[PDB]
């Protein structure tokens, strides 16, 4: 049984998305849909997911850009891991 979230994608671009747009980025299983990524993220960090953009990477993986609701704070979420 493959899991959805593989690990946080942490790079300069990710940090900006986190500080400026309340977005979190993850390396996820390429078989995962935007919806499955949303659910997984909410169930793992107890947050509300507003939008999910995806991209199949030239590393053979899928990257997800998850925007959280204004109710949540990406910076704080990512900081506890």
């Amino acid at each position: 049984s493959w899991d959805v979230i593989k690990h946080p994608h942490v790079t300069e671009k990710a940090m900006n998305d986190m500080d400026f747009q309340n977005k979190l980025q993850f390396a996820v299983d390429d078989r995962a849909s935007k919806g499955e990524v949303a659910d997984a993220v909410e169930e793992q960090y107890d947050v509300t997911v507003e939008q999910v953009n995806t991209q199949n990477t030239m590393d053979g993986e899928k990257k997800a850009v998850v925007r959280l609701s204004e109710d949540d704070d990406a910076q704080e979420v990512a900081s506890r891991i």
Partner: peptide
Amino acid sequence: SKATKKRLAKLDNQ
């Protein structure tokens, strides 16, 4: 395609 892309990615990694 997605698969072609996976193969290209692997080649890059190797």
